[PDB]
Design a protein around this ligand. Sequence first.
Ligand SMILES: *[C@@H]1O[C@H](CO[C@H]2O[C@@H](C)[C@@H](O)[C@@H](O)[C@@H]2O)[C@@H](O[C@@H]2O[C@H](CO)[C@@H](O)[C@H](O)[C@H]2NC(C)=O)[C@H](O)[C@H]1NC(C)=O
Ligand SMILES: *[C@@H]1O[C@H](CO[C@H]2O[C@@H](C)[C@@H](O)[C@@H](O)[C@@H]2O)[C@@H](O[C@@H]2O[C@H](CO)[C@@H](O)[C@H](O)[C@H]2NC(C)=O)[C@H](O)[C@H]1NC(C)=O
Ligand SMILES: *[C@@H]1O[C@H](CO[C@H]2O[C@@H](C)[C@@H](O)[C@@H](O)[C@@H]2O)[C@@H](O[C@@H]2O[C@H](CO)[C@@H](O)[C@H](O)[C@H]2NC(C)=O)[C@H](O)[C@H]1NC(C)=O
Ligand SMILES: *[C@@H]1O[C@H](CO[C@H]2O[C@@H](C)[C@@H](O)[C@@H](O)[C@@H]2O)[C@@H](O[C@@H]2O[C@H](CO)[C@@H](O)[C@H](O)[C@H]2NC(C)=O)[C@H](O)[C@H]1NC(C)=O
Ligand SMILES: *[C@@H]1O[C@H](CO[C@H]2O[C@@H](C)[C@@H](O)[C@@H](O)[C@@H]2O)[C@@H](O)[C@H](O)[C@H]1NC(C)=O
Ligand SMILES: *[C@@H]1O[C@H](CO[C@H]2O[C@@H](C)[C@@H](O)[C@@H](O)[C@@H]2O)[C@@H](O)[C@H](O)[C@H]1NC(C)=O
Ligand SMILES: *[C@@H]1O[C@H](CO)[C@@H](O)[C@H](O)[C@H]1NC(C)=O
Ligand SMILES: *[C@@H]1O[C@H](CO)[C@@H](O)[C@H](O)[C@H]1NC(C)=O
Ligand SMILES: *[C@@H]1O[C@H](CO)[C@@H](O)[C@H](O)[C@H]1NC(C)=O
Ligand SMILES: *[C@@H]1O[C@H](CO)[C@@H](O)[C@H](O)[C@H]1NC(C)=O
Ligand SMILES: *[C@@H]1O[C@H](CO)[C@@H](O)[C@H](O)[C@H]1NC(C)=O
Ligand SMILES: *[C@@H]1O[C@H](CO)[C@@H](O)[C@H](O)[C@H]1NC(C)=O
Ligand SMILES: [Cl-]
Ligand SMILES: [Cl-]
Ligand SMILES: [Cl-]
Ligand SMILES: [Cl-]
Lengths: 524, 524
Amino acid sequence: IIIATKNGKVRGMQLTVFGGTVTAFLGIPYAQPPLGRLRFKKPQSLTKWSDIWNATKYANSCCQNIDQSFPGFHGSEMWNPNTDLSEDCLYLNVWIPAPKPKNATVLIWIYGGGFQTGTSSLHVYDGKFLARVERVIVVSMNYRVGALGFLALPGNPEAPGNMGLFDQQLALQWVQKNIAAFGGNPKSVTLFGESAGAASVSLHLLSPGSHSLFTRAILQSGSFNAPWAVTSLYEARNRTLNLAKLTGCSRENETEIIKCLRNKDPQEILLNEAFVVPYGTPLSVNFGPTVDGDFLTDMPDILLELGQFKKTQILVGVNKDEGTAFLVYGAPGFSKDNNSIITRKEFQEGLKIFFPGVSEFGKESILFHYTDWVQRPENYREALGDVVGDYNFICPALEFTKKFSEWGNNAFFYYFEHRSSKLPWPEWMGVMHGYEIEFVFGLPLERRDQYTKAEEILSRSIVKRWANFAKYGNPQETQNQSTSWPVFKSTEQKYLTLNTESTRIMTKLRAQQCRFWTSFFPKV
Amino acid sequence: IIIATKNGKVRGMQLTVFGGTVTAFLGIPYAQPPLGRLRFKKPQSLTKWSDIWNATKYANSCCQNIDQSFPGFHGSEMWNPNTDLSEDCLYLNVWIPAPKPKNATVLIWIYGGGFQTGTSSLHVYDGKFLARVERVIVVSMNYRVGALGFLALPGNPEAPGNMGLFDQQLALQWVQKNIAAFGGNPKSVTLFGESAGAASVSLHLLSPGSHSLFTRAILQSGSFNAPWAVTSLYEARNRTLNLAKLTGCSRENETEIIKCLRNKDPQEILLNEAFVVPYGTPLSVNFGPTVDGDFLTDMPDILLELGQFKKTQILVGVNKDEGTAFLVYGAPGFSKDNNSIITRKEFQEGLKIFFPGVSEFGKESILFHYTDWVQRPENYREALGDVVGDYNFICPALEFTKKFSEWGNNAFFYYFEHRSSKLPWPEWMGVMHGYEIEFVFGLPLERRDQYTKAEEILSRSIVKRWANFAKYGNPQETQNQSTSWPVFKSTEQKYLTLNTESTRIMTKLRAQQCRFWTSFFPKV
Ligand SMILES: *[C@@H]1O[C@H](CO[C@H]2O[C@@H](C)[C@@H](O)[C@@H](O)[C@@H]2O)[C@@H](O[C@@H]2O[C@H](CO)[C@@H](O)[C@H](O)[C@H]2NC(C)=O)[C@H](O)[C@H]1NC(C)=O
Ligand SMILES: *[C@@H]1O[C@H](CO[C@H]2O[C@@H](C)[C@@H](O)[C@@H](O)[C@@H]2O)[C@@H](O[C@@H]2O[C@H](CO)[C@@H](O)[C@H](O)[C@H]2NC(C)=O)[C@H](O)[C@H]1NC(C)=O
Ligand SMILES: *[C@@H]1O[C@H](CO[C@H]2O[C@@H](C)[C@@H](O)[C@@H](O)[C@@H]2O)[C@@H](O[C@@H]2O[C@H](CO)[C@@H](O)[C@H](O)[C@H]2NC(C)=O)[C@H](O)[C@H]1NC(C)=O
Ligand SMILES: *[C@@H]1O[C@H](CO[C@H]2O[C@@H](C)[C@@H](O)[C@@H](O)[C@@H]2O)[C@@H](O[C@@H]2O[C@H](CO)[C@@H](O)[C@H](O)[C@H]2NC(C)=O)[C@H](O)[C@H]1NC(C)=O
Ligand SMILES: *[C@@H]1O[C@H](CO[C@H]2O[C@@H](C)[C@@H](O)[C@@H](O)[C@@H]2O)[C@@H](O)[C@H](O)[C@H]1NC(C)=O
Ligand SMILES: *[C@@H]1O[C@H](CO[C@H]2O[C@@H](C)[C@@H](O)[C@@H](O)[C@@H]2O)[C@@H](O)[C@H](O)[C@H]1NC(C)=O
Ligand SMILES: *[C@@H]1O[C@H](CO)[C@@H](O)[C@H](O)[C@H]1NC(C)=O
Ligand SMILES: *[C@@H]1O[C@H](CO)[C@@H](O)[C@H](O)[C@H]1NC(C)=O
Ligand SMILES: *[C@@H]1O[C@H](CO)[C@@H](O)[C@H](O)[C@H]1NC(C)=O
Ligand SMILES: *[C@@H]1O[C@H](CO)[C@@H](O)[C@H](O)[C@H]1NC(C)=O
Ligand SMILES: *[C@@H]1O[C@H](CO)[C@@H](O)[C@H](O)[C@H]1NC(C)=O
Ligand SMILES: *[C@@H]1O[C@H](CO)[C@@H](O)[C@H](O)[C@H]1NC(C)=O
Ligand SMILES: [Cl-]
Ligand SMILES: [Cl-]
Ligand SMILES: [Cl-]
Ligand SMILES: [Cl-]
């Protein structure tokens, strides 16, 4: 199977999925390799090839540091890259139903990883189930991460910032130009992403250059108003110069810092990213999106508040225990290998880990708000996870959703509360960050994979709802006497819970907690 | 002029006021003197006299401690009692227009003084101007204050608590039974009071026993939800027993503590009131209203929240600088005799004076909320006064008004912002607590008294508005092209400013401050 694209022919491969066939085109190039003088620059458009590009395997993942905290452990290792790392990493994947569809809706996946890590070739991002079961086309891209994707000296085209967001955008352009050849509808394109991938989706909603590149958006556990999502111009400058210092690249001329950094081995840039900040946290984003005057024209909070964004439907949600994953990456008393019963003093020390530049009063205020107990040994352990999840994911997603919906558009909010039967992490971590993704991609639809029957049913329902959102703007499951998913409006704030037992309509998720983070805490 | 009352004849006296005449009956008894075995008991009804009771001078003021902080100084001394102190103090005053009116509306004044001090014979409470100018009848009563008015051991008729509130109530009953003989309408009775007198008015709104004793209510700088206004049953017990200790009255039997206290000289009870608490403040109310199961059937906050109160119109207001008066009664760096520029550390020490049993985090939170400066030497001095005024008077009056109006009734709120040209206190204290009162009573209507012309005009307008509220439920001045006073509703929260220059309709008084006190601070 060979498809002709604007830049040349690509050969795919046939896959058997559930007694049917999917065609996969893995590793199509969508930009010039950003090597040499192109390092730190916006991606440059790719010129024609002749002969057939073989898109029959996943391409290189972008250069990135790896999580070495738990070698041999599937819970962490499943997120590490599974393809060689290389600066030559600007590739995308396409999965299409067979037979070729006529005008299929397109789902474009944007991975998370804190803007520092990630790749589209992870097993939990495999678009073949969606293509098979819902007859949508799935596209995913690799984009640059870390300093190589996000180093900024604002205004300077040698290192303007947001390069990895421009990579995403150019892959969106590729779909616009090329997807009809694969049987796709460029006028029916939904972005979906998790964590930094969801924050990215929310920035494409804000970016005038992305407005005509997609139709609708799905935000899983992330949005640009999250505290980790956008680097200030002040932080970015200091981090860029710190990185120059650490590599011997400190210079009088800023265009000469960049020239120097372009001579460094990728591996030397990677080694020094960790230290560009005095204190870090398990949620640090050393190199992330900045207000660059190009992708992002103003501080995104101002854009959101004043309604300057693409007017379309959004689907947004979070997991019940967003904060737990992070606690084993440095909070005292915590271990994935015991029940992590901590004391008051450990709790207090954990706040120092998660809120390093925060006044003592700021920290006491967190403790005040989260330790009014309803005695119980896991009180403090539970409070720290909620602190981290509410601050970093849940309250920001809910505020994004309120503010976005106030401008007239339909929004749907979910609260995912199912723990995978196969989860390798301990029970105390509950419904973790990242662990809805396999349900969205339909992994539990595979009977060989040993998920429960209740999990097959949940995943089939989520898959259908996501697909209906993409095709029709409305994440209903219309056939199986399912709970209707109400629109989220800033007054009632109705959301849908996703679980194997009973799906419920609820209101005002974490009302009391989010008043704290959203209205008090930003003042300290 | 001799009027026959249910309990006997009373002779009044004629007064010349503004080229006209008022009849004053000063010092009519309304209960049995609460002496001897009646000390600490509810007031007992008075039996008939023959011959003519001469109500031609003010009666004794109730026993109370005096403000000795500033001897010789009119600013403080004008609030001290101006009649002999005596346990024999249950008397009231009546001022009536001449000629005798036919069915005049009645204004009943309830003085403030923290429930510890006060008397109806103060010059600034002289009802003759109102009677003259508006042809209303004015009534005022003395009620017991301090431990003699409010000592409680709940349930025990020897000392049930709220005795001074029962004194007020019995004087309300006297007006019901007797005012028609003076030309008054018992079906048109408005209560008005300032500070503890306004808190009292707000408790009569809650008390089933007072419901048929009045029509409408005016609350000047006070309401029962103020932090100083209601003593917990826990505080009351401890204070009663502390007082017993300090007087040698500690006993096994509680009815024997009271018997013992009844043998003490009034003057010995007074000397020990100050110490019944370990820490006090300039706003301490050692002996005040309690939930006694009789006057007050439940915690008044519950009654207010759940709409269990007299359904009628209210007029409520506060002064611009409620908090300043108190700062010279113990805050470091403050003096009525210099400009009281204080430092951060003095500010912090002042919080300790005003918030003695409050956690360090509680205090830091106050400081956080009030020291975000918009440098300026008077920053800290101004912040402390606002802290004290917002917490103790303004935010509580506004919350009372919101909650009360949510039940359907018209409410009118004012913000009094005129500083008396004659004020003896320094300019930095601004528009002080207590200093609207002379405008309400029409003192500036007296040309001999050397107030400005702008002050005569302001007082004449307030007088008319207060009188119209009493007679008609609507505090308008209809004749002189005046600003219309809108109803206060919990959504718009419109209020009227009272000043000599420009009277304005404004909204959401101290919105940001009161969110702090009303919604955060009660948690610490
Ligand atoms: C901006 O960066 C400076 C630089 O300090 C850093 O030097 C880098 C090359 C890197 O190795 C990094 O780890 C190191 O901290 C920061 O100043 C430092 O601040 C810390 C803590 O306040 C102090 O211990 C150091 O004295 C100080 N270092 C120097 C050399 O000045 C600074 O914190 C940072 N500013 C922001 C916005 O975070
Ligand atoms: C849960 O484990 C933590 C984490 O650290 C430990 O991991 C264990 C599984 C074990 O292999 C141990 O050797 C390893 O150090 C425990 O916290 C540790 O416990 C003690 C006393 O508090 C200290 O020696 C360590 O500093 C501390 N580590 C950290 C990172 O804080 C924790 O006590 C344990 N909790 C249980 C069993 O409930
Ligand atoms: C209830 O009252 C007690 C009694 O203490 C008081 O004794 C009284 C007769 C009187 O002189 C008063 O000034 C004195 O404080 C309070 O206990 C006291 O608390 C303070 C400060 O915490 C301590 O310094 C004392 O040790 C302690 N005194 C005694 C003898 O126990 C107590 O504070 C109070 N409770 C409440 C609700 O405020
Ligand atoms: C305003 O006066 C205060 C109050 O105390 C003083 O009253 C003055 C009018 C004067 O007679 C003085 O003798 C009397 O003690 C001043 O605070 C005082 O100032 C000094 C230094 O801060 C200390 O000696 C006192 O402890 C302190 N008193 C109190 C109660 O805190 C204050 O400095 C003054 N401020 C000015 C002039 O701006
Ligand atoms: C494919 O359908 C096109 C329009 O369908 C889409 O309309 C969009 C506005 C959006 O709402 C999508 O979700 C809809 O599905 C049509 O214009 C094209 O011509 C079609 N192309 C084909 C059949 O080749
Ligand atoms: C005096 O007027 C009485 C009624 O007037 C009042 O009606 C109340 C319900 C209240 O709204 C007041 O503010 C009104 O002024 C009437 O019943 C009496 O009979 C009158 N008594 C006389 C003239 O002696
Ligand atoms: C692409 O794959 C085809 C079919 O397997 C092969 O014949 C061709 O040589 C390939 N091109 C390469 C490896 O460049
Ligand atoms: C910085 O150096 C570069 C060297 O390539 C040069 O192009 C540029 O003009 C210099 N900038 C300034 C303004 O000094
Ligand atoms: C609805 O349930 C049927 C079985 O009754 C199942 O076969 C089908 O896949 C379900 N559809 C969805 C979208 O959940
Ligand atoms: C009351 O006053 C009248 C008139 O001045 C007087 O004659 C009478 O004796 C008085 N009664 C007293 C003092 O008890
Ligand atoms: C307390 O003592 C008084 C003495 O007058 C007595 O009437 C009462 O019965 C005693 N109470 C109890 C229950 O001990
Ligand atoms: C209205 O103004 C007139 C003068 O024009 C004055 O005599 C009168 O007292 C005023 N009335 C009120 C109630 O303020
Ligand atoms: Cl600090
Ligand atoms: Cl369902
Ligand atoms: Cl403390
Ligand atoms: Cl006016």
